[PDB]
UniProtKB/TrEMBL annotation, chain A:
The gene coding this protein: POLR2H
A Pfam family matched in the record: RNA_pol_Rpb8
Biological processes per GO annotation: DNA-templated transcription
Chain segments annotated as transmembrane: none
Protein name: DNA-directed RNA polymerases I, II, and III subunit RPABC3
Cellular-component GO terms for this entry: RNA polymerase I complex; RNA polymerase II, core complex; RNA polymerase III complex
Organism classification: Eukaryota, Metazoa, Chordata, Craniata, Vertebrata
Keywords: DNA-directed RNA polymerase, Nucleus, Transcription
Similarity comment text for this entry: Belongs to the eukaryotic RPB8 RNA polymerase subunit family.
SMART domains associated with the record: RPOL8c
Subcellular localization: Nucleus
InterPro entries: NA-bd_OB-fold, RPABC3
Task of the protein: DNA-dependent RNA polymerase catalyzes the transcription of DNA into RNA using the four ribonucleoside triphosphates as substrates. Common component of RNA polymerases I, II and III which synthesize ribosomal RNA precursors, mRNA precursors and many functional non-coding RNAs, and small RNAs, such as 5S rRNA and tRNAs, respectively.
Source species of the chain: Sus scrofa
Molecular-function GO term, any one: DNA-directed RNA polymerase activity
Length: 148, 96, 469
C-alpha cells in the first residue's frame, strides 16, 4: 500500500495561537523516536482529539492496498480494493511544496514537506531520509488512528 | 477531502471546480497579518490568508474582493489574459 | 503481455533517465538476501576470462549459500561445517579428485556445482558439532569394513565384475569420491547388461544397473554404532567382527538409501525383519496390491505425458507373434489377502553383520520385480486380429506367480508357475494336461533366457520351441 511514512506521533499542543477557524484545530505534535514535527489540522467535531494523545500516522500513496492509481473519483460502492479501513481518519490531499534547507553546494538534511489536505493543511518536517518518499503534485492519503 | 469518519467535501474543493482550466495566481486576503510572511509558518498560514491557486485548484486561503473582484491581478483577470473570453463568462456565471 | 507492459514502462521513462535512477538509488541508500541470490544468478550467466571465472567460482559459493575465502589468485576455499574444499574440519584434505579437477579445467562449472550440492547433502547431518565429527567417523568405519568385506570375496574367488554384482558379498563397491557416497550395486538385469552385448571390464558405469548408496542419517531414536573399524580380526572365509564397546549412542543409524524406491512385498518385510529386527516401515503407512506398484515403477522409468490407462492389460509386440499380458492383481493368496507391498527407499542397519542376509532377501525381491517388470509396456495394441496371444499373471503365493496361456498346439490352458527363490534363481514348472503335446524342455527355455533377457521373452521361447517340434 505504498506506506510513505509512519510513526506514533504525540499531540503536544492543540492550538498555539487561537481558535482561528471554529471546527478546525491545528494539532502541533512531535513524533517520538524519529523526532519529526507535524502541524496537522483536523475536523474537531468528527475526530475529537485531546491534548497528549498518541496517534498512528500513515501518509500512504494508495488506500487500495493492492497497488494501482486512484483515478481521483469517489467510487462510492467500490469495496473491491478492501483498502486500509482499519484507520479512522482518512483525509485525502495533495503536496504543495517540498521545501528544504540546501546551500548551493550541498543537499539539505532537514527537508520540510508542506502537504495540503483539502484546504486544511499539514507540515511534516524532519530528517531528510524519512520524508524522502514524497514528491510535489501527488495525491497522498493521511490515515490516523488513536492508539492508547 | 475527509473520507473515513464520514464523506465530507471541503469548500475549497468545490470552488476548484468552477475555476477554469489551469491558472497560477498568488494574492493576499483582505485580512492579512503584517508579519506572517517573514516568520515561521509562512507557507502553512495560521489564518488562511495567502490564496495560492496552483494548476486550477485553490490549494489554500480565503477569497476576498482583491482576490475575486475588479483589480489588477484578480483571479478573474488571470483568466482573461490566459484562458479566454467564453470560458471566463461561463466561470463567472457558475461561481455566481 | 508482461513484456509489452515493461516496454510501455520504458516508453514512459523515455518521456520522463538512467542517471536519474542512479541518483534515486543513492538517495535511498542515504535514507538484501534476495539481491545477494540475484547476484549469483547473473554472475552464473557471466562467462569471460580466468579472473571472471574466479568470480564465477565466487558465484557458485553464494549459489549454494557457502562462504568463500581466497588466499592469492590461485587458491579459493569454500567453507561450511567440515565441508571445506580448495580449488588451486577434523580431517586432512583427502584427495585431488581427478573428477573435480577435470571438470574445472574443462568448461564445466555446472558439473562442479552438482558436486558441491552432493557434498552439502551428505553433511546436511543435524547433530551439533563434536557429535557430527564422531558421526562422520562411524561412517568411515562402516566404509572401511564394507570395503574389506568386498576385498575378501575377490581374494577368495577372482570373480569378474558381473559375478560380484549379481552374486557377491556386499556388491561392486565404488569408494566415496567427493559428494558421491559409496554405491553398492545390488543387481544387473540381463536385459539391461545388453545395450542396443556389453562386456563390463573394470569400467562399469555408475548407473548401468540397480545401485544403492550407504550413508549416515539422523534419526529420532538413539542407536549404538561402531566408532572404529570393527573388522580388526578377519576369519579367512567370510568375516568376523570384534564385539561392540568401540561405540557411542549417537541419535542416528547407518542407512542403505535406494535412488528409486523399490516396491517390496509384505512377506519380504517379515523375512527381512527376522534377521535385522529394526522395523522396516516403523509407523505403518499404506499397503496396496504389489502388482500395481511394480507397474508404476516400470512405467515411470520412462516418463510420458499420457498415463497408460492399462487396466492391467499390457500389450507386448515381439519379433515373432504379438502377446497381451493381464497382471491379475487382487487374485487371493493362500492366506486370502492379495499380494500387498509398499515402496521402500531407506533400509536402516546398525552393523554390517545382518547386511549380507538383508541384501540376499532384497536381491530375490528385486529379481522377481525385474522378471514381472519386463512385461509392463506402453503398447496401444488396438483392434489386433492376428495373434494377440493372451496370457494372465496371477499371484499364487508370496514369491510365486503363474503365467497362464492356451496350449500352443492343443486347446487346454497350460500354466507355468515361476518362483523367485533367490535374486538370480527362478524355478519354473509347466503344468500340462494328461493328454497334451510335449510343449518344451525346461532347460532349453532357461538357456535362451540367460543368453538374452526378460520374461515377456520367456513366453516367446516356450511358444517357438513347441512349434519347432
Amino acid at each position: 500500500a505504498g506506506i510513505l511514512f509512519e510513526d506514533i506521533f504525540d499531540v503536544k499542543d492543540i492550538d498555539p495561537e487561537g481558535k482561528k477557524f471554529d471546527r478546525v484545530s491545528r494539532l502541533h505534535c512531535e513524533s517520538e523516536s524519529f523526532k519529526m514535527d507535524l502541524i496537522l489540522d483536523v475536523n474537531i467535531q468528527i475526530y475529537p482529539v485531546d491534548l497528549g494523545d498518541k496517534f498512528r500516522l500513515v501518509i500512504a500513496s494508495t488506500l487500495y492496498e493492492d497497488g494501482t492509481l486512484d483515478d481521483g473519483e469517489y467510487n462510492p460502492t467500490d469495496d473491491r480494493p478492501s483498502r486500509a479501513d482499519q484507520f479512522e481518519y482518512v483525509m485525502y490531499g495533495k503536496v504543495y511544496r517540498i521545501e528544504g534547507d540546501e546551500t548551493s553546494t550541498e543537499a539539505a538534511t532537514r527537508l520540510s514537506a508542506y502537504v495540503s489536505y483539502g484546504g486544511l493543511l499539514m507540515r511534516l518536517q524532519g530528517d531528510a531520509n524519512n520524508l524522502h518518499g514524497f514528491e510535489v503534485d501527488s495525491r497522498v492519503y493521511l490515515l490516523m488512528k488513536k492508539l492508547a | 477531502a475527509i473520507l473515513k469518519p464520514r464523506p465530507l467535501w471541503t469548500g475549497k474543493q468545490i470552488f476548484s471546480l468552477i475555476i477554469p482550466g489551469h491558472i497560477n495566481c498568488i494574492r493576499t486576503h483582505s485580512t492579512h497579518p503584517d508579519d506572517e510572511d517573514s516568520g515561521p509558518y509562512k507557507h502553512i498560514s495560521p489564518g488562511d490568508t495567502k490564496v495560492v491557486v496552483e494548476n486550477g485548484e485553490l490549494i489554500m486561503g480565503i477569497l476576498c474582493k482583491k482576490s475575486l473582484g475588479t483589480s489588477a491581478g484578480s483571479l478573474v483577470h488571470i483568466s482573461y489574459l490566459e484562458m479566454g473570453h467564453d470560458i471566463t463568462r461561463l466561470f463567472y456565471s457558475n461561481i455566481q | 503481455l508482461s513484456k509489452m507492459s515493461s516496454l510501455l514502462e520504458r516508453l514512459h521513462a523515455k518521456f520522463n533517465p538512467w542517471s536519474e535512477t542512479i541518483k534515486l538509488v543513492r538517495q535511498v541508500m542515504e535514507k538484501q538476501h534476495l539481491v545477494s541470490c540475484l547476484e549469483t544468478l547473473q554472475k552464473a550467466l557471466k562467462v569471460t576470462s580466468l579472473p571472471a571465472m574466479t568470480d564465477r567460482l565466487e558465484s557458485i559459493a553464494r549459489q549454494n549459500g557457502l562462504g568463500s575465502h581466497l588466499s592469492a589468485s590461485g587458491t579459493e576455499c569454500y567453507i561450511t561445517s567440515d565441508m571445506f574444499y580448495v580449488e588451486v574440519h577434523h580431517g586432512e584434505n583427502p584427495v585431488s579428485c581427478p573428477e573435480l579437477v577435470q571438470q574445472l579445467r574443462e568448461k564445466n562449472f555446472d558439473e562442479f556445482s552438482k558436486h558441491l550440492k552432493g557434498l552439502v547433502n551428505l553433511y546436511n547431518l543435524p547433530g551439533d558439532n563434536k557429535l557430527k565429527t564422531k558421526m562422520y567417523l562411524a561412517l568411515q568405519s562402516l566404509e572401511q569394513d564394507l570395503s574389506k568385506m568386498a576385498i575378501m570375496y575377490w581374494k577368495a574367488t577372482n570373480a569378474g565384475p558381473l559375478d560380484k554384482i549379481l552374486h557377491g558379498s556386499v556388491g561392486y563397491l565404488t569408494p566415496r569420491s567427493g559428494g558421491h557416497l559409496m554405491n553398492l550395486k545390488y543387481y544387473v538385469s540381463p536385459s539391461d547388461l545388453l545395450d542396443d552385448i556389453i562386456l563390463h571390464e573394470n569400467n562399469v558405469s555408475r548407473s548401468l544397473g540397480m545401485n544403492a548408496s550407504v550413508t549416515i542419517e539422523g534419526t529420532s531414536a538413539v542407536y549404538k554404532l561402531p566408532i572404529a573399524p570393527l573388522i580388526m580380526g578377519s576369519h579367512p572365509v567370510d568375516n568376523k567382527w570384534t564385539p561392540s564397546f568401540n561405540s557411542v549412542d549417537l541419535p542416528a543409524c547407518f542407512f542403505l538409501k535406494f535412488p528409486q524406491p523399490i516396491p517390496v512385498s509384505r512377506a519380504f518385510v517379515q523375512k527381512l525383519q527376522n534377521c535385522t529386527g529394526i522395523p522396516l516401515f516403523e509407523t505403518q503407512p499404506t499397503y496396496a496390491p504389489l502388482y500395481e506398484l511394480i507397474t508404476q515403477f516400470e512405467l515411470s522409468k520412462d516418463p510420458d505425458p499420457i498415463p497408460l490407462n492399462h487396466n492391467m492389460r499390457f500389450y507386448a509386440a515381439l519379433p515373432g507373434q504379438q502377446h497381451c499380458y493381464f497382471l491379475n492383481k487382487d487374485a487371493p493368496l493362500p492366506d486370502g489377502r492379495s499380494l500387498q507391498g509398499t515402496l521402500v527407499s531407506k533400509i536402516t542397519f546398525q552393523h554390517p553383520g545382518r547386511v549380507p542376509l538383508i541384501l540376499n532377501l532384497i536381491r530375490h525381491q528385486v529379481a522377481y520385480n525385474t522378471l514381472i517388470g519386463s512385461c509392463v509396456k506402453r503398447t496401444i495394441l488396438k483392434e489386433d486380429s492376428p495373434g494377440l496371444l493372451q496370457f494372465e499373471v496371477c499371484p499364487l503365493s508370496e514369491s510365486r506367480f503363474s503365467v497362464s496361456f492356451q496350449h500352443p498346439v492343443n486347446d487346454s490352458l497350460v500354466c507355468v508357475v515361476m518362483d523367485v527363490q533367490d535374486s538370480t534363481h527362478v524355478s519354473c514348472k509347466l503344468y500340462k494336461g494328461l493328454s497334451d503335446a510335449l510343449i518344451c524342455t525346461d532347460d532349453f527355455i532357461a538357456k535362451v533366457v540367460q543368453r538374452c533377457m526378460s520374461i515377456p521373452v520367456t513366453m516367446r521361447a516356450i511358444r517357438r520351441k513347441a512349434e519347432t517340434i
